[PDB]
Amino acid sequence: MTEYKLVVVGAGGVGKSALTIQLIQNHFVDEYDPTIEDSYRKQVVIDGETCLLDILDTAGMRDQYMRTGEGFLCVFAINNSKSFADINLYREQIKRVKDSDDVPMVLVGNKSDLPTRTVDTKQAHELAKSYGIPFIETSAKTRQGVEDAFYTLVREIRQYRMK
Ligand SMILES: Nc1nc2c(ncn2[C@@H]2O[C@H](COP(=O)(O)OP(=O)(O)O)[C@@H](O)[C@H]2O)c(=O)[nH]1
Ligand SMILES: CN(C)Cc1[nH]c2ccccc2c1[C@H]1NC(=O)c2ccc(O)cc21
Ligand SMILES: CN(C)Cc1[nH]c2ccccc2c1[C@H]1NC(=O)c2ccc(O)cc21
Ligand SMILES: [Mg+2]
Ligand SMILES: [Mg+2]
Secondary structure (H helix, E strand, C coil): CEEEEEEEEECCCCCHHHHHHHHHHCCCCCCCCCCCCEEEEEEEEECCEEEEEEEEECCCCCHHHHHHCCEEEEEEECCCHHHHHHHHHHHHHHHHHHCCCCCCEEEEEECCCCCCCCCCHHHHHHHHHHHCCCEEECCCCCCCCHHHHHHHHHHHHHHHHHC
16 A cells, blocks of 8 residues: 655644544544654545555654655644744755755644634735645644645645656
């Protein structure tokens, strides 16, 4: 089967662990150790293709997992303006490490269930447009958009390999 190495990046507290646990274990984790960096495997069928996902949940970071990673979920929280601005730091570090401007990535606006929005969908669509990448809103709490974010990332890696 086809293997895909995904990296979940973003500021502390955006929901990287909650998003990873929601996809892997189908449950919402309200308090996961913020310093723990782990990897998870999941066998899934995406567009009729049996895939093995090797997902790294980062805890922030180093050029090494950026070298290994084939696709990046760049996560910010819709109630945290600083986490949205932090996206560019990850983008630029990934770009330098990979020596490329077309690295598979998806911009994720997590905590979409929260009414305390400080990042508008237009700000985020403008950011995603500038990078030339998809923008997906998610809620690791309700599961809304979780599969769409991770599977769009797989589809992006598949497209990149295909050219
Ligand atoms: N309301 C809401 N809370 C979330 C969501 N995702 C994560 N959280 C909470 O945000 C906090 C930080 O999440 P965590 O997954 O540890 O973030 P990380 O540091 O990026 O891994 C925890 O208290 C989570 O329960 C979400 O989509 N909605
Ligand atoms: C059973 N198939 C339906 C699987 C499937 N679903 C897709 C959806 C979008 C794009 C391609 C595909 C493929 C394959 N067809 C390809 O050209 C290709 C290239 C690399 C792969 O890893 C997989 C595929
Ligand atoms: C090999 N897999 C079973 C684990 C795993 N899954 C990944 C998905 C995307 C990117 C990297 C990885 C890795 C590791 N390979 C690394 O280079 C690295 C650096 C730091 C880590 O914490 C983990 C890894
Ligand atoms: Mg975490
Ligand atoms: Mg403002």
